[PDB]
C-alpha cells in the first residue's frame, strides 16, 4: 500500500575476461559522500523505513528500555596492578566515558585520577581514547586520543606529579606506542593521510617538538599492518608487520636511545608468527611446520634453531600464550570448544583448566606482571554471564574476581546445547543454541540463527544480555559454527574462504534445516542475522533459500563482492585478495560471481528483510546495501517489506552511544519480533 522509494536506473556496463554485468545502480556510489540524488535515495529509504516501522514504536521503547534496566550504570573495573601501581577503570552513572584512576600498589585509601574521559570530552564534538600507559618509572602517562572519529590518534603527555600536559602533540598515530625503559623515548606508529594505513615507526623524546622525531622504520608493502609491542621481559620493544597471512618482527633495544630495528625471521609468503621475550629467551608462536601453530623456544633469530615446546597438531589449534615465573599457559581450540593449558618450566607438569558447559567461551584474560602463580582468565556461556577468575596456577585454588551483573536475570531460567550437523558435504559443523525452558516446546519455537564465518572469527559462544528480550520471547537463538569461521582450527576457516567460500553459505543452510528436521524451531518462524562478511553470508543464504527464512536483518552487508573486488580505490579491497580471492583471475571472477550476492538477486519471492548501513564510516561502503535494495525492490516478486537504514551521523554521532548500540538492537528486535508474533 505504501510505495517504496524507486532508485533511477543508469545502466552501466562492467567488462571483465569478455563478460558483461550490467550494473543499474553504480551511480549510489560517491566517495565525496555530497551527490543530492544519492543522498535523496538513502534519506527515501530512510524515510520508508520511518514510515513502515512507526507501528513498532512501542515495542522498540519496550525493549531498549528492558535492556538498559538489566546493566548497571556503574561498573568498577577488576584492580590491577603493574609495575608498583592498581589501576581501575568507573563508570559513574550518567557519564558518557570512562575514568581512569590509579594508587600505589601499598595504599587502600586514596584513589588518583590519571585521565577523565568526561573532562577530555568537554566542549569537543567526539571523543574516543586509543591508548594509555604510564612509563616505566611511574612519572609520565601517554595518553592516545581521537577528538575527529578518523580513528586518528593524537598522543600527548601528563607530568603525573602536578598533572600538568608536556606541549607537543604526535598526530596521525595508529595509537600503538611503547615507551623505552628510560621513560623518556617514546616509539609510536604514523598512519598515511590518503591511504589512512600504519606505514611508519618513529622514536620521540618526551617534552620536545614532534619535528626533531627519527623515522625508524618504513613499511615498503601495504597489505602489511605495523603494530608496536614491548616484551614480557621489557627488554625489546617490537616492530610487528603482518599482512593476513605472513608475518616479520624487529627488534628494538628499549634499553638505549639509538636503537635500530634488528630482523628476527625475514618475512616468507604463509609463515604466522609472533614472538615474546622472557627468562633470557624468545618465545615464538609459528605455523612454519603446521597450520594449527607450534609453540617454540629460542636464544637467537635462526628458525633453524628454534627448540619445539609444543608441536602443531592437526587437532589443536594455539591460538596465543602467557609467561609465568614457573608456568607457560597457552589457549588452544579443540574439538569446536576454546580451552587454557598450563605446562610447569622445570617438571613439564601439564594441567588443563576444566570445563562443565557445552557451549561456553574461555580466554586469557590481562595478565600484566609475570611474576605470580596468579591466572587471570575469562569465561562466558550462553547461560553464565561473563566471568573473570583468578586460578593459583600451583594449588590450582579458582576463585571469582568479577561476574557481570545481569538485573531481571535468573541463569536456570535458560537451556543450552552444543548440537553437530552433517553437512551435505558429510563434514560436521558445530551448532551453539540457548532458549528458556519454560516456553520451549519442540517445533513450536521461533529461531534466530546467527553466523559470520570469514576471516577465521569465531562466534565463539558466550552471555548476552541483549538476547534476553529474544529468550524471554519465546526464541531459540543459535550460534551456526559454520566454515570460513575458525571454530574447528585452521582448516575450518581454509574451508570457508577463496575457492571454498560456498561451504560458508552451505553450513548455514545445512545447519537451519537440521535445526528444523529436529523440531528445534517452528519452520514458519525462522530468522537469521549476520553483518558486515556476516552480511555477505545473509545475502547469499536467501539467493540460494529463501523459502528457508521468515525474516533476515543484514547488517552492512558485504553483497557487491565481484564489482567492489576489481576496484583497488575502495578501501579495504587489497588486504581482502587472500579472503575471497582477486576477480582480476578468471578464476576468482567466476568462483565470486556465483555467490556475489548482488549480482546472484533474481526475480523470485526473497524473505522479509531489514537491511543497515552508515554514511560517513567505511567498514562495507554504504553503496553496496543500497545498490542491492535498490535491485532487490526492482526484481523480487514476494510483497513482503524490505527495509533500508542508512545510518545517517555525519562524522560518526559515537560521542559514547551505547544508547545507539542499544537503540540499533531495539529497532532490530522488534522488526524481527513483530515478525514472529
Known amino acids: 500500500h505504501m510505495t517504496p522509494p524507486k532508485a533511477e536506473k543508469r545502466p552501466y556496463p562492467i567488462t571483465t575476461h569478455g563478460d558483461t554485468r550490467v550494473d543499474d545502480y553504480y551511480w549510489l556510489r560517491d566517495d565525496e559522500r555530497t551527490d543530492p540524488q544519492v543522498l535523496d535515495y538513502l534519506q527515501a529509504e530512510n524515510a520508508f523505513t520511518d514510515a513502515a516501522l512507526k507501528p513498532q514504536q512501542a515495542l522498540r521503547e519496550t525493549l531498549y528500555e528492558e535492556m538498559v534496566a538489566r ?290 567461551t574461555t580466554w586469557l584474560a590481562y595478565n600484566p606482571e609475570p611474576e605470580t602463580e596468579l591466572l587471570r582468565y575469562g569465561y562466558s556461556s550462553m547461560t553464565t554471564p561473563t566471568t573473570l577468575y583468578e586460578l593459583n596456577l600451583d594449588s590450582d585454588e579458582r576463585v571469582m574476581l568479577k561476574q557481570q551483573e545481569v538485573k531481571n536475570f535468573t541463569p536456570e531460567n535458560y537451556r543450552s546445547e552444543r548440537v553437530w550437523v552433517k553437512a551435505r558435504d558429510g563434514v560436521e559443523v558445530p551448532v551453539s543454541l540457548v532458549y528458556r525452558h519454560d516456553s520451549f516446546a519442540r517445533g513450536t519455537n521461533p529461531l534466530m540463527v546467527y553466523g559470520y564465518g570469514s576471516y577465521g572469527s569465531s562466534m565463539d559462544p558466550a552471555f548476552s544480555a541483549s538476547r534476553l528480550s529474544l529468550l524471554d520471547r519465546g526464541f531459540v537463538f543459535v550460534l551456526a559454527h559454520i566454515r570460513g569461521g ?73 553483497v557487491d563482492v565481484v564489482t567492489t573486488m576489481l576496484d583497488e580505490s575502495i578501501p579495504l579491497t587489497t588486504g581482502e585478495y587472500d579472503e575471497w580471492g582477486n576477480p582480476n583471475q578468471q578464476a576468482y571472477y567466476d568462483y565470486i560471481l556465483q555467490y556475489s550476492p548482488y549480482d546472484q538477486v533474481k526475480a523470485q519471492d526473497y524473505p522479509h528483510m531489514l537491511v543497515t548501513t552508515g554514511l560517513h564510516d567505511s567498514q562495507v561502503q554504504y553503496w553496496e546495501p543500497a545498490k542491492w535494495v535498490a535491485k532487490l525492490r526492482e526484481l523480487k516478486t514476494d510483497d513482503r517489506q524490505l527495509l533500508l537504514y542508512t545510518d545517517m551521523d555525519s562524522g560518526h554521532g559515537g560521542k559514547s552511544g551505547r544508547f545507539k548500540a542499544y537503540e540499533d538492537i531495539a529497532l532490530e528486535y522488534a522488526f524481527i519480533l513483530a515478525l514472529a508474533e
Do not use: C
Open 486 to 558: 575458525g571454530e574447528l582450527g585452521q582448516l575450518w576457516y581454509e574451508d570457508g574462504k577463496l575457492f571454498k567460500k560456498q561451504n560458508t553459505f552451505n553450513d548455514f543452510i545445512d545447519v537451519t534445516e537440521a535445526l528444523i528436521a529436529q523440531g528445534y524451531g517452528d519452520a514458519k518462524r525462522v530468522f537469521a542475522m549476520g553483518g558486515a562478511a556476516g552480511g555477505l553470508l545473509m545475502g547469499a543464504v536467501i539467493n540460494q533459500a529463501p523459502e528457508l527464512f521468515n525474516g533476515i536483518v543484514a547488517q552492512v552487508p558485504f
Open 71 to 360: 546493566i548497571p550504570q556503574q561498573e568498577h573495573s577488576v584492580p590491577y596492578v603493574r609495575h608498583g601501581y592498581r589501576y581501575q577503570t568507573r563508570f559513574e552513572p550518567g557519564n558518557e566515558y570512562a575514568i581512569y584512576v590509579r594508587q600505589p600498589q601499598a595504599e587502600s585509601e586514596h584513589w588518583d585520577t590519571l585521565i577523565d574521559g568526561n573532562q577530555r570530552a568537554e566542549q569537543r564534538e567526539f571523543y574516543t581514547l586509543g591508548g594509555l600507559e604510564v612509563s616505566p618509572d611511574n612519572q609520565k602517562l601517554a595518553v592516545a586520543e581521537d577528538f575527529l572519529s578518523r580513528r586518528q590518534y593524537d598522543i600527548r603527555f601528563k607530568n603525573l606529579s602536578d598533572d600538568s600536559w608536556t606541549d607537543e602533540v604526535l598526530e596521525n598515530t595508529s595509537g600503538s606506542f611503547e615507551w623505552a625503559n628510560d621513560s623518556a623515548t617514546v616509539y609510536y606508529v604514523r598512519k598515511h593521510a590518503k591511504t589512512l594505513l600504519p606505514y611508519q615507526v618513529y622514536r620521540h623524546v618526551v617534552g620536545t617538538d614532534p619535528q626533531l622525531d627519527e623515522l625508524i622504520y618504513e613499511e615498503q608493502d601495504d597489505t602489511f599492518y605495523v603494530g608496536l609491542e614491548k616484551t614480557t621481559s621489557d627488554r625489546f620493544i617490537l616492530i610487528h608487520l603482518s599482512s593476513t597471512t605472513t608475518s616479520e618482527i624487529l627488534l628494538l633495544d628499549a634499553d638505549r636511545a639509538d636503537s635500530t630495528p634488528q630482523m628476527f625471521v625475514p618475512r616468507r609468503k604463509d609463515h604466522e608468527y609472533g614472538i615474546d621475550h622472557y627468562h633470557q629467551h624468545f618465545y615464538i608462536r609459528s605455523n612454519k611446520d603446521g597450520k594449527n601453530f607450534g609453540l617454540y623456544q629460542s636464544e637467537q633469530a635462526d628458525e633453524a634453531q628454534w627448540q619445539t615446546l609444543i608441536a602443531p597438531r592437526i587437532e589443536v589449534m594455539l591460538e596465543g600464550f602467557s609467561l609465568f615465573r614457573d608456568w607457560l599457559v597457552v589457549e588452544e581450540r579443540s574439538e569446536g570448544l576454546t580451552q587454557l593449558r598450563q605446562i610447569h618450566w622445570q617438571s613439564g607438569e601439564v594441567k588443563r583448566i576444566a570445563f562443565d558447559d557445552p557451549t561456553y
